[PDB]
Amino acid sequence: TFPALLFGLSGCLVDFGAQAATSDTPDDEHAQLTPGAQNALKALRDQGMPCAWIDELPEALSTPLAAPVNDWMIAAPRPTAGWPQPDACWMALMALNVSQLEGCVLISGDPRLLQSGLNAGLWTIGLASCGPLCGLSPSQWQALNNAEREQRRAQATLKLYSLGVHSVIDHLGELESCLADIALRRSKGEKP
Amino acid sequence: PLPTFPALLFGLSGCLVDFGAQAATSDTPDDEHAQLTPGAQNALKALRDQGMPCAWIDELPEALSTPLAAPVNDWMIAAPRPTAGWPQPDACWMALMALNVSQLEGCVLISGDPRLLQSGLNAGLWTIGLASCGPLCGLSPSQWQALNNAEREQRRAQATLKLYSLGVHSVIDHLGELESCLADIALRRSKGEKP
Numbered sequence: 035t036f037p038a039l040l041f042g043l044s045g046c047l048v049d050f051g052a053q054a055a056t057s058d059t060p061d062d063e064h065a066q067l068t069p070g071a072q073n074a075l076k077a078l079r080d081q082g083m084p085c086a087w088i089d090e091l092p093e094a095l096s097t098p099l100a101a102p103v104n105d106w107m108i109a110a111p112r113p114t115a116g117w118p119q120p121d122a123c124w125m126a127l128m129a130l131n132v133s134q135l136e137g138c139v140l141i142s143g144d145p146r147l148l149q150s151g152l153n154a155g156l157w158t159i160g161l162a163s164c165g166p167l168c169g170l171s172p173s174q175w176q177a178l179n180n181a182e183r184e185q186r187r188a189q190a191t192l193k194l195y196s197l198g199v200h201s202v203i204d205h206l207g208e209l210e211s212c213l214a215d216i217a218l219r220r221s222k223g224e225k226p
Numbered sequence: 227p228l229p230t231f232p233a234l235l236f237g238l239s240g241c242l243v244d245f246g247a248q249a250a251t252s253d254t255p256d257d258e259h260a261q262l263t264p265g266a267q268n269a270l271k272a273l274r275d276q277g278m279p280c281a282w283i284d285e286l287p288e289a290l291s292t293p294l295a296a297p298v299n300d301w302m303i304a305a306p307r308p309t310a311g312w313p314q315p316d317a318c319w320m321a322l323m324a325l326n327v328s329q330l331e332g333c334v335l336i337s338g339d340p341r342l343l344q345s346g347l348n349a350g351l352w353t354i355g356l357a358s359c360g361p362l363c364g365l366s367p368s369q370w371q372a373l374n375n376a377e378r379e380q381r382r383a384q385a386t387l388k389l390y391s392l393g394v395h396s397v398i399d400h401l402g403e404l405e406s407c408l409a410d411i412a413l414r415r416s417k418g419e420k421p
């Protein structure tokens with residue numbers, strides 16, 4: 035079983051290309067859910083899956099960004115010790131009252147958040163298209179040719195695996211299958 | 227060389243001090259309960275000399291655990307009390323945070339209390355159980371010493387089986403065995419074993 039799923043906010047649930055930090059101003063476009071995020075969240079709410087979002091942006095920037103998910107998921111309490119310390123992830127799991135670490139998963143495209151999850155002892159899922167390793171807005175990503183999007187994904191994928199991340203997928207539309215494969219690995223005895 | 231340990235967590239009562247968890251028998255603090263458990267001075271010198279980050283964990287009221295921590299408070303951190311108590315992982319995670327631990331990997335909890343050990347297992351830690359001094363034995367030093375050898379062996383064996391049944395990783399008779407116990411866990415880790 036999965037006691038909880040933790041999600042990055044920007045460059046993960048919303049803000050494709052992690053553009054909200056790129057400015058000190060809020061921007062309406064950035065609160066858009068990333069490809070596959072809406073339906074992944076529908077499924078998680080229907081399942082009753084405990085979930086929380088995690089980010090390091092100032093509340094002024096993260097509040098408008100979280101609006102799309104605030105009906106699905108709490109903001110984890112911010113630690114005094116930030117990423118890559120494990121604290122953020124432990125405090126998220128604690129806010130969700132999880133009974134045990136085993137089976138908890140963090141999903142992000144940000145290496146600093148992913149490292150927090152790795153340090154904390156969670157399973158980790160990296161996102162290949164929408165995080166800061168790619169850093170392109172939706173319109174920018176769409177303007178590339180096929181070969182370019184492939185190159186960008188593959189490059190981010192290897193960077194993420196080099197961190198020690200357990201699985202990398204293109205987008206949150208792949209989350210369900212990704213989690214099912216972690217379940218199979220776990221049944222074979224794999225631990226984070 | 228073998229993998230190293232970044233931090234060690236210890237129960238206070240029935241583990242570092244208070245053989246037989248006798249602080250649970252009275253609301254007022256008893257100076258006799260602050261006696262360190264057999265082998266503790268030996269284990270703790272090695273750890274303190276090494277600069278091993280260590281914190282203690284308990285659930286007793288402050289009126290009791292503060293006096294109990296007297297023989298270790300020169301150097302060992304008191305873990306902050308969690309809102310959600312054992313067997314929730316919170317007590318152990320909060321202790322690791324208090325030690326500014328950078329990774330869960332290799333962290334160990336030592337206790338004879340099944341509820342605290344369960345917290346450590348839930349928190350994802352390595353666990354070492356104590357067969358003599360914890361609540362499953364629940365006898366004061368005088369009561370423990372009044373038994374015969376056979377009765378002490380029987381009680382250690384019973385506690386040892388219960389702790390392994392919980393899923394604890396290694397069980398030892400007392401803290402004098404901690405160094406060797408840790409060395410064998412490091413060897414297991416070197417062979418790819420995880421908690």
Ligand SMILES: [Mg+2]
Pocket residue numbers: 187
């Ligand atoms: Mg591909």
